Design a binder for this molecule. Structure first.
Ligand SMILES: [Mg+2]
Ligand SMILES: [Mg+2]
Ligand SMILES: [Mg+2]
Ligand SMILES: [Mg+2]
Lengths: 213, 190, 457, 256, 40, 107, 226, 180, 251
RNA sequence: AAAAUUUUAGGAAUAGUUAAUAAUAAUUUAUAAUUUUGAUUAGAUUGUUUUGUUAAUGCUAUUAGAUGGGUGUGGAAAAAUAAAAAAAA
């Protein structure tokens, strides 16, 4: 918005200064890992956990915290839900989109995400695995999605996983994949016990951007 | 009304004019100790309980109460009590962890005098400067691990002898000769 | 005893100007900003932060008294380092504005001359990046779960992901004042001075500058001529000083302010404003030596043109004679609407001009004043669904309704307009509601809530 | 079951993500302790940073303490090379030859026109600064990284005569950059970090070598002790690698 | 509470409450009046 | 680099970090081989999840599913008590059988 | 919160309302959104005394010994039909009778046409599930001569409160597309003789005299003698 | 949101709810009974002190003869007295800024004091509750309605800032010669 | 209710209470529900002022390689009916889908046909809408659509490319909500029009001797009602408006 | 998240265990952690404005109320009789 161009322009004018001595690092503190409160809070790199009244010199950001979005199928008791999971890397400024894929693959801790090949895309347009973040104007604020192989098949009943509510789960597939891990047959402590949202939660029509009634 | 005699009482529901509305807790109850165990067999190794045990904390005679005024508050303005401590580093066996012995103060109002007690803390030194026998400044902070709420704020006095002792490959300080006391007699010869 | 930084001084001088009290700004100046310098070739550009920040050597810690070791964050300590970006030219500008506002020519001439000279002959200071605390660094969010634009089937809901309503008020499309070059800041400074002239004129004659509350609105005030003279001399002073350099910078905001001064103080019909603006732009394309390719009047300028037309046709409503309306002496609706029409033709022609609610409002108002009786159709085609509105629309529109042939049309049109108000989230204002109430004997339209009336009695 | 239910190291809030996002819309997952991993662990070091205009131009000359013959340092660095090359021989182009080992006290850009005025004037000021300073015994242990893990060096511990160095350097810093305006890549009111550069990746090399020296090589030597050295000799050197087989030396000062 | 009169719409059900709040138009008008007063 | 920052709150290791100085005591082989073992975690991990995705996905299955099984699923003052046996001693004999003593550390 | 009753005025809990806002008060429960509902209990509640003396069969009783006289079957069908309309008529019971499943017709619920309340629904399209009397029904809402821009699922289509009026002019074939009827302020120029506005945003109705009589005869102003 | 509701003392919303000004006292023989005006939360616990925001005062519901003042032949003064202590800075804070609620009995009290108008529950059963019709109300409103600006300024003075600066104190506060 | 600050409660990996991510299925009617009211707005824009990529001369051609990094999001209008190559053709005859194009076909160009085109590899989509006849809007001369023969040969088509099963964001329609005035009503007073002399002003309201005809007397409704819609927080119709104003609900 | 204050006449060892790594490890790495400045088990006991005596540093009382997890709802578990809290006209 306004911030982005205000600070961009500020940086760009700062770089064209003929006369500047350079900052004194005894006057330019780092950040503290030690502050009150139990939680450990990660902030912007321009920001500190103490009060600093003075505005520090604009720096180019050498580690850009990209966010890459995935679609997961979350099991809730009623049936499957399709929701969103972000993976966040720190990708060096000049890095190549291939390398961004690689960093993204290493950083995900969920078993259900990276199984097949995925393509990075912005507003539905694929990115060249060949070229730099610089060219595509990728910043933290930029919205990056990720698209799997079978994702364009999800409108069918096949690729989309089958919920034991409406579908047979057989000794074929009891031993394979999220079904196996889930332990469909109830145990005393009830197995891994997944989040549940009921059937009448959204009414007769499911969740939408547009009000349908 | 607590200032009125036994016979002077009329109503028990209100204070007529002013003063303190006081409930009488009955202090003399003749409470007693029940003896459930033989003097031979008492079911504890280190200590035996034969009488009525005094209870509470600060209700405990003779009263021992927290004393804010000591060396530590003398030097520091603390936002919260115990937010600053000065102590000595005792041992570093744990990476990025300095154990620190510190003194604090207790006041006995009966005898009108103070005692110094001592307490150990785990402090977090990133970068591992602290050598056993350093005089350090220590502060309260973010919870770091199960037992570490404190970090090393500044080394007041480093240990120069200990550091040069390390540089030569030797331990910072000689290991204590005897460990904890025992109730046995160890006969170990040659 | 907190020493104000340059930013703080700016703010307080803004308060001074708007208050028009020179005697505040003078003491403030004298006390704090005196030694404030400009930036020269030998100056070092944004000065590094030099402060140590506060620590204690072990001897300082142990041997000092309690208070010498007490650090509360004290504004005074970093004042030097808040000032490290050299915002001085702003202070000088504000101070010019004040000396003008308090009606003193010599002092104003002084500050403005210093400023002009420095802007011409000295380097442009490096701007400060956006203050983390005043304005907040935008934090990352996915915009996925959001009420869609069409979420409510009855209207256009604006949304966090994009704006479908369109701009309610025209914005100037210039970066924050500190990001300007020195020449650009010279221009900006002149437009600022003009704006203060205008404000002072409106504080001296609030009656004449308010639209259509009095017939006094249609006629130049005496003292308007000396004012416009001042403005003339000022602008020609700007063309005298800046040379060919003017060809390279944005004159848009300057123009719109110029136009608004010649619309308000001197009162010029819409055609006179368009003429004036075109002559100005020709002047700017000619001083730079080139092939032309004139920049067109930007949206804000056109806003001043149109509001010029609306000033042209304006009525004092409801004389105590139960006489309908008074109009500007020597008023021709035909001419006015002629020029307005081909002007809107011109605007809608140019693809780079973004429309806003206020522009439409000026047009609509000119339509009502002209007795066009097309005001409705324009409003419903171009505005109603696709913008967020004031109730000012419905005010002038009501004046339009009132003039139709039979009564029933009046009534029904008015009622329908209220329904519009309920549908589109216009909170129909008190002014409008009073306008409707006045005719209650004729139209029988109830404007008040039940509860409101009860409570009232 | 073998520890805290919620391990304390895993409690992390990301404030650089918008408020409300993590509660409803989506959850954000990251390995957050790669970033939180500190300056001691990574081995980074914060050098005096250049203003952009100075950052544009290559450095030409530098101040150096010359290491004498028969050093503890040179010997142990040779031992370290042996070990590293036996582990991974992809290091071979990264490593600096033991012949070029020197202590870097500061770096500077001299333009080629004013060259002689500047070298004479510098040399003189340098000789005046170091007039009173007797030789310096400094201690080397530990490794560190400059320029995002591209430069791998041996730290100079502030346990010894180092203190004196700091005043000494800060004087020439205030002469060479303060008095006669010269481009020291930093501020003259700031002190440079002295170091012995061991491995380095130049721009040309970077393609075949990679963008950062993998920490797996030097992890074990990170805190290794290279020993003590006394230093009598200060040089101002231009960087030419073929003139004498050692950095081409434009000026010299003896500490005695 | 919300007052439920006897001439509210009777719900014939054995599985739940016997009387649904639904108002005779009279009751609505009345309620409006009382509530105007308390608005005052 | 021996002093901490009063206004900043940052420790001495922090201002030492910022001035680009390193105070560190000479280390024995313990601390050296611990640190040199820890430094490399991410390279080992990157190599693991590049070159061997199935093994990784197995372990992850176990972790992810574990998060739903177990004692506490959500973090509250009870769950997020750093010292569980200490703050609830009143549970230790009867209800909670995991711990046999109320104190495992200084406090 | 977004839209309070009488602004915040707290002098009584009842002063607020029966719901604080139109919007759901907890975010975790969306269905708490303020709707316009309908007395489902009474309006389902079909009359079982209509099925007295009938002898219905079931679906899966196909047996030869089980079924009955064709006359008995016919009066059974008529009894069942009377049982289904016994409350009012469901949309899907109205729509199957009209041409083109009643596309284009205006379906008003009884209470939408009485008092100052004026509202109806133009039918855009219909999905009959296998069971009639149920389904989904989409359309445009028209409230006081002001119409929706896009179609919407008609709420409470299953509850039997609905009436409509068949007009050949409004009929649309399944081939074409049902146009939204014009909102009277915008698309069609406002006319008094064609359409007059019942009630408008600040209006409300005068007092009907029998209500007044009754309320005074309640509060004890006007006397009432046994 | 309790699984088995506490049946006897229900409330509205979660506890602790918006602070409400209550009258409460321990129950005793009627001859000695006093009450406490107390700002506290909506959901009380066993002892009323746990949620107690402020203590507004004592109120004694026993008409008293005034023996503090000299016996006065004035008719009205020798009616019995009813004594109450109000803390009105805290009251105006809590009620005004914090937006409290009010039970009815304290309302009757503070009405007697002149802090509040008489409550909703105080009924002369002589008069009925009024009727309303909008056209008559409208005629009365068209009959009397003040000017817009007058009304806006009244709302300004009552709700927003009261204390304003006359031109005089301006002239007296603006700097003189050496810095003017 | 406001959105709470951050989630410290549940592990991130597991993600727990999360509004489902809405995804647009092209096989259902729901797709068109999303896309339709945008199209109309889009066309409206095209009728007033020019937008650059809206009008192409011919079908866009790209290699297989660059297919999915160029096409998705692209929306352009063509004069004739020609269906993009390597696209399987689906006719949309199902009435529920057709339904949402109602407003667009009545108050803008009549919709002749709708087509769902899916690429053979199945990962791309083209929504193709064929309009018949001239706009029911007036068309400006300098406007984009004035360069088209199908408006102002009477058939012409809109083409919209998109990925299947994506959120109704990355079909990019929201860039188009720029709003330009239709200058048709003022075209009367321009110096170009010869009907500008047939115009006459009404400056003053005409003397009126009669009040508006009074509304028919109010019949109080006879059936049961759900209670005050004020107190139930129901907006005036259950339709639109603010809950404070109870107009037009029964009483 | 912590800091202080913590009882038994005759006194010994305690343990899903410390610290670093990390959304690791039922077998990661380490010279680990608690204790005689009194631990852990075990007895007794409802913890830091409430009483009684007294000229007085003292002695002598103070109730009651937070008892783990196992589809985890809720803003917060405080959620299975036992009010004396007006709980959407
Ligand atoms: Mg603890
Ligand atoms: Mg026990
Ligand atoms: Mg709220
Ligand atoms: Mg249980």
């Amino acid at each position: 918005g306004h911030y982005q161009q205000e600070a961009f322009e500020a940086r760009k004018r700062f770089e064209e200064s003929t006369t500047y001595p350079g900052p004194i690092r005894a006057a330019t503190p780092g950040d503290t890992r030690f502050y009150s409160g139990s939680l450990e809070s990660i902030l912007h790199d321009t920001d500190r956990h103490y009060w600093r009244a003075v505005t520090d010199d604009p720096r180019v950001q050498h580690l850009i915290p990209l966010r890459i979005r995935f679609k997961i199928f979350t099991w809730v008791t009623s049936g499957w839900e399709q929701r969103m999971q972000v993976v966040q890397i720190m990708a060096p400024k000049d890095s190549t989109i291939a390398q961004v894929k690689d960093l993204v693959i290493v950083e995900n801790q969920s078993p259900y995400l990276c199984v097949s090949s995925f393509h990075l895309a912005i507003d539905g347009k694929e990115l060249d695995p060949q070229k730099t973040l610089g060219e595509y104007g990728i910043t933290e604020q930029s919205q990056i999605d990720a698209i799997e192989q079978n994702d364009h098949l999800l409108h069918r009943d096949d690729e989309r996983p089958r919920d034991w509510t409406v579908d047979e789960i057989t000794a074929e597939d009891v031993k394979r994949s999220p079904y196996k891990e889930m332990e469909m047959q109830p145990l005393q402590n009830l197995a891994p016990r997944y989040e549940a949202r009921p059937k009448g939660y959204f009414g007769r029509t499911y969740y939408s951007g547009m009000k349908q009634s | 009304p607590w200032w009125n005699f036994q016979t002077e009482h009329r109503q028990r529901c209100v204070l007529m004019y002013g003063g303190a509305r006081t409930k009488n807790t009955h202090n003399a109850n003749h409470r007693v100790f029940i003896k459930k165990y033989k003097r031979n067999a008492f079911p504890n190794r280190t200590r035996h309980h034969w009488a009525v045990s005094m209870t509470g904390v600060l209700s405990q005679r003779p009263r021992r109460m927290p004393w804010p005024y000591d060396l530590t508050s003398l030097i520091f303005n603390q936002p919260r009590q115990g937010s600053d401590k000065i102590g000595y580093v005792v041992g570093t066996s744990m990476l990025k962890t300095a154990v620190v012995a510190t003194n604090h103060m207790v006041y006995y109002p009966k005898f009108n005098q103070r005692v110094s007690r001592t307490k150990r803390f785990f402090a977090h030194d990133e970068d591992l400067a602290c050598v056993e026998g350093d005089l350090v400044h220590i502060k309260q902070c973010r919870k770091i691990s199960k037992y570490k709420h404190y970090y090393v704020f500044s080394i007041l006095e480093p240990n120069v002898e200990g550091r040069e002792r390390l540089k030569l490959g030797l331990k910072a300080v000689p290991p204590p000769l005897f460990g904890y006391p025992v109730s046995r007699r160890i006969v170990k010869l040659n | 005893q907190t020493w104000p930084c340059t930013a703080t001084i700016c703010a307080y001088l803004d308060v001074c100007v708007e208050a028009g009290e020179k005697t505040w700004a003078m003491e403030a100046w004298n006390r704090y900003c005196t030694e404030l310098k400009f930036l020269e070739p030998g100056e070092v550009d944004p000065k590094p932060i030099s402060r140590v920040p506060f620590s204690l050597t072990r001897e300082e810690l142990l041997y000092l008294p309690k208070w010498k070791k007490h650090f509360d964050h004290d504004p005074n300590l970093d004042v030097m380092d808040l000032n490290r970006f050299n915002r001085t030219r702003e202070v000088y500008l504000r101070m010019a504005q004040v000396m003008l506002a308090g009606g003193e020519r010599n002092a104003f001439q002084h500050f403005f001359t210093k400023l002009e000279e420095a802007m011409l002959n000295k380097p442009t200071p490096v701007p400060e990046p956006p203050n983390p605390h005043l304005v907040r660094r935008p934090r990352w969010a996915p915009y996925e779960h959001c009420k869609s634009v069409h979420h409510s089937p009855w209207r256009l809901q604006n949304n966090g992901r994009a704006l479908a309503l369109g701009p309610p008020v025209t914005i100037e499309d210039e970066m924050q004042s500190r990001f300007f070059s020195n020449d650009q800041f010279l221009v900006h400074s002149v437009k600022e001075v003009l704006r203060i002239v205008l404000q002072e004129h409106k504080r001296a004659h609030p009656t004449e500058c308010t639209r259509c509350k009095t017939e006094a609105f249609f006629y130049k005030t005496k003292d308007a001529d000396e004012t416009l003279k001042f403005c003339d001399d000022l602008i020609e002073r700007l063309f005298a000083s800046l040379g060919v350099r003017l060809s390279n910078l944005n004159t848009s905001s300057l123009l719109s302010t110029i136009l608004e001064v010649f619309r308000v103080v001197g009162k010029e019909s819409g055609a006179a404003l368009l003429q004036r603006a075109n002559e100005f732009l020709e002047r700017k394309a000619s001083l730079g030596d080139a092939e032309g390719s004139r920049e067109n009047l930007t949206a804000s300028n056109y806003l001043q043109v149109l509001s010029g037309f609306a000033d042209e046709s304006a009525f004092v409503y409801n004389t105590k004679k139960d006489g309908t309306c008074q109009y500007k002496t020597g008023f021709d609706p035909r001419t006015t609407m002629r020029h307005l029409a081909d002007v809107v033709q011109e605007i809608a022609g140019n693809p780079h001009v973004t429309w806003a609610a206020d522009m439409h409002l000026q047009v609509v108002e000119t339509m009502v004043g002209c007795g066009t009786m097309k005001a409705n159709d324009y409003f419903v085609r171009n505005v109603l669904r696709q913008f967020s509105w004031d109730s000012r629309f419905l005010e002038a529109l009501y004046v339009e309704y009132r003039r139709q042939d039979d009564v029933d049309m009046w009534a029904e049109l008015t009622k329908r307009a209220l329904v519009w108000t309920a549908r589109y989230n216009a909170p129909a204002s008190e002014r409008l509601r009073r306008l409707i109430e006045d005719d209650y004997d004729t139209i029988r339209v109830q404007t008040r809530t039940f509860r409101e009336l009860a409570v009232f009695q | 079951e073998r520890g805290l239910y919620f391990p304390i190291n895993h409690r992390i809030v990301d404030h650089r993500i918008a408020p409300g996002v993590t509660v409803e819309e989506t959850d954000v997952q990251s390995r957050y302790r790669r970033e939180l991993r500190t300056n001691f662990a990574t081995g980074e070091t914060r050098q005096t940073i250049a203003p952009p205009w100075s950052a544009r131009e290559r450095p030409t000359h530098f101040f150096s303490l010359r290491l004498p013959s028969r050093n503890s340092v040179t010997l142990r660095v040779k031992e370290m090379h042996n070990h590293l090359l036996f582990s991974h021989q992809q290091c071979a182009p990264m490593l600096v030859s033991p012949t070029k080992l020197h202590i870097t006290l500061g770096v500077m850009t001299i333009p080629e026109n004013s060259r002689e005025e500047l070298v004479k004037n510098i040399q003189q000021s340098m000789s005046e600064t170091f007039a009173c300073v007797q030789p310096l015994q400094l201690r080397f242990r530990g490794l560190g990284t400059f320029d995002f893990g591209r430069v791998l060096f041996i730290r100079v511990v502030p346990e010894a005569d180092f203190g004196r160095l700091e005043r000494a350097v800060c004087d020439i810093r205030r002469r060479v950059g303060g008095v006669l305006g010269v481009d020291l890549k930093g501020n003259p009111h700031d002190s440079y970090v002295p170091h012995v550069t061991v491995a380095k990746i130049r721009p040309n090399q970077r393609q075949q070598l990679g963008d950062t020296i993998p920490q797996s090589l030097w992890a074990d030597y990170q805190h290794h002790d290279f020993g003590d050295v006394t230093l009598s000799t200060v040089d101002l050197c231009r960087m030419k690698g073929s003139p004498d087989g050692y950095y081409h030396t434009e000026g010299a000062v003896h500490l005695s | 509470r919300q007052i439920r009169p006897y001439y509210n719409l009777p719900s014939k059900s054995e599985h739940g409450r016997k009387m649904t709040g639904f108002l005779t138009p009279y009751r609505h008008w009345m309620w409006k009046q009382n509530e105007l007063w308390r608005n005052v | 680099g021996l002093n901490g920052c009063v206004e900043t709150g940052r420790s001495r290791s922090e201002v030492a970090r910022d001035l680009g100085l390193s105070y560190t005591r000479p280390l024995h082989e313990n601390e050296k081989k611990q640190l040199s073992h820890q430094a490399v975690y991410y390279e080992r991990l990157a190599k693991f999840k590049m070159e061997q995705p199935e093994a990784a996905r197995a372990m992850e299955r176990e972790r992810f599913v574990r998060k739903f099984s177990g004692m506490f699923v959500k973090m509250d003052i009870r769950s997020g008590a750093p010292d569980f046996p200490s703050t609830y001693r009143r549970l230790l004999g009867t209800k909670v059988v995991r711990w046999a003593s109320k104190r495992h550390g200084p406090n | 919160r977004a839209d309070p009753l009488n602004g915040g005025s707290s002098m009584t809990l009842g002063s607020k309302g029966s719901k604080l806002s139109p919007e759901p008060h907890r975010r975790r429960m969306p269905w708490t959104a303020a709707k316009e509902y309908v007395p489902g209990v009474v309006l389902n509640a079909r009359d079982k005394m209509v099925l007295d003396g009938v002898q219905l069969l079931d679906i899966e009783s196909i047996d030869r010994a089980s079924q009955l006289d064709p006359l008995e079957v016919l009066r059974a069908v008529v009894a069942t039909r009377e049982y289904n309309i016994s409350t009012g008529k469901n949309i899907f019971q109205l729509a199957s009778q009209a041409t083109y499943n009643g596309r284009g017709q205006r379906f008003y619920r009884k209470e939408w046409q009485e008092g100052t309340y004026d509202k109806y629904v133009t039918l855009s399209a219909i999905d009959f599930d296998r069971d009639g009397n149920k389904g989904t029904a989409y359309g445009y809402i028209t409230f006081h001569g002001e119409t929706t821009t896009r179609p919407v699922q008609v709420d409470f289509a299953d509850v039997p409160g609905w009436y409509m009026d068949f007009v050949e002019e409004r009929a649309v074939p399944f081939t074409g597309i049902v146009p939204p009827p014009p909102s009277i302020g915008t698309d069609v120029p406002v006319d008094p003789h064609s359409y007059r506005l019942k009630a408008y945003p600040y209006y409300d109705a005068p007092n009907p005299p029998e209500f007044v009589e009754r309320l005074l005869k309640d509060r004890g102003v006007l006397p009432d003698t046994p | 949101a309790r699984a088995v509701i506490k049946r006897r003392s229900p409330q509205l919303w979660g506890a602790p709810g918006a602070p409400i000004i209550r009258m409460r006292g321990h129950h005793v023989v009627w001859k000695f009974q006093s009450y406490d005006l107390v700002v506290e939360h909506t959901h009380k616990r066993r002892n009323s002190d746990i949620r107690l925001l402020h203590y507004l005062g004592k109120h004694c519901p026993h008409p008293q003869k005034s023996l503090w003042s000299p016996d006065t032949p004035v008719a009205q003064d020798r009616h019995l007295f009813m004594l109450t202590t109000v803390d009105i800075d805290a009251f105006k804070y809590w009620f005004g800024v914090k937006r409290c609620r009010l039970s009815m009995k304290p309302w009757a009290l503070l009405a007697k004091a002149g802090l509040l108008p008489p409550s909703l529950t105080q009924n002369s059963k002589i008069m009925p509750k009024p009727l309303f019709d909008k056209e008559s109300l409208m005629r009365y409103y068209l009959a009397n309605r003040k000017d817009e600006d007058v009304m806006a300024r009244e709302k300004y003075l009552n709700y927003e800032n009261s204390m304003v600066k006359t031109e005089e104190e301006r002239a007296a506060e603006r700097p003189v010669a050496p810095y003017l | 209710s406001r959105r709470f600050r951050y989630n410290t409660k549940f592990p991130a990996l597991v993600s727990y209470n999360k509004l489902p991510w809405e995804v647009v299925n092209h096989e259902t009617p729901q797709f068109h529900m999303h896309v339709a009211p945008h199209y109309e707005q889009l066309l409206t824009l095209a009728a007033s002022s020019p937008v650059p990529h809206i009008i192409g001369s011919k079908h866009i051609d790209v290699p297989r390689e660059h297919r999915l990094r160029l096409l998705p999001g692209m929306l352009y209008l063509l004069d004739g009916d020609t269906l993009p190559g390597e696209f399987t053709i689906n006719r949309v005859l199902d009435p529920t889908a057709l339904q949402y194009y109602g407003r667009l076909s009545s108050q803008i160009v009549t919709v002749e046909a709708v087509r769902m085109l899916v690429p053979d590899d199945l990962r791309l989509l083209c929504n193709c809408i064929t309009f018949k006849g001239p706009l029911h809007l007036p068309v400006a001369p300098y406007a984009s659509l004035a360069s088209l023969r199908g408006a102002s040969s009477n058939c012409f088509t809109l083409y919209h490319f998109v990925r299947p099963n994506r959120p109704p964001k990355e079909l990019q329609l929201e860039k188009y909500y720029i709003h330009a005035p239709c200058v048709a009503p003022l075209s009367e007073f321009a110096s170009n029009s010869d009907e500008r002399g047939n115009w006459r002003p009404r400056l003053q309201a005409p003397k009126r001797t009669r009040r508006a005809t009074p509304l028919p007397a109010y019949r109080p409704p006879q059936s049961y009602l759900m209670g005050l819609a004020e107190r139930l927080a129901v907006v005036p119709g259950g339709c639109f408006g603010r809950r404070s104003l109870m107009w037009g609900h029964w009483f």
